[PDB]
Ligand binder design. Structure first.
Ligand SMILES: [Mg+2]
Length: 177
DNA sequence: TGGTC
């Protein structure tokens, strides 16, 4: 398979189908490397959970199949069309693993001051000062970078690097809970 | 109030 191939998750497959029927469904869109039905072994006999993974050899074939099938094609006996999307095992750079909690921020700071402070470390895609139900700043912020490496460099360079106005302790910079 | 969506 190509180094950029995508394993795809496919839902709304008839439980009666196996890899044999799925091979006939998918191969017209491109060469298929692997098909695996997700199975339930909780009792005897085991059964299909009604979904599968398909890995095309090429990324282009995976994307064309997804474009052609997802919410388009209804398989026999089904009441809803195929759902098709990249498999969760393909996720690599999750937002939660590149989001920082910034603590001990001056209650005066706004999202723009934080961006100015953390911009040197990479592309910021989200920045929020945290506010309670009264609307008052809670003295902390969330900063999401585009990659985890950016977030880690910000931690090493900024954690306890200074104490802001009105704060009892130096700024805290850590991966968010 | 050292406060994590
Ligand atoms: Mg408090």
């Amino acid at each position: 398979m190509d180094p950029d191939a995508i394993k795809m998750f496919v839902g709304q497959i008839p439980r009666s189908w196996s890899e044999k029927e799925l091979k006939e469904l998918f191969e017209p869109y491109g060469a298929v490397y692997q098909i695996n039905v997700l199975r339930d072994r909780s009792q005897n006999p085991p059964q299909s959970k009604g979904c599968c993974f398909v890995t095309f050899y090429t990324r282009k074939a995976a994307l064309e199949a997804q474009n052609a099938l997802h919410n388009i094609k209804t398989l026999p006996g089904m009441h809803h069309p195929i759902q098709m999307k990249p498999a969760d095992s393909e996720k690599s750079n999750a937002v939660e693993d590149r989001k920082l909690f910034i603590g001990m921020v001056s209650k005066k700071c706004n999202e723009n001051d934080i961006r100015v402070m953390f911009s040197p470390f990479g592309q910021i895609e989200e920045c929020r000062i945290l506010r309670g139900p009264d609307g008052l700043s809670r003295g902390c912020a969330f900063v999401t970078f585009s990659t985890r490496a950016m977030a880690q460099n910000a931690i090493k360079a900024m954690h306890q690097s200074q104490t802001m106005e009105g704060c009892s302790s130096p700024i805290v910079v850590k991966f968010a809970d």
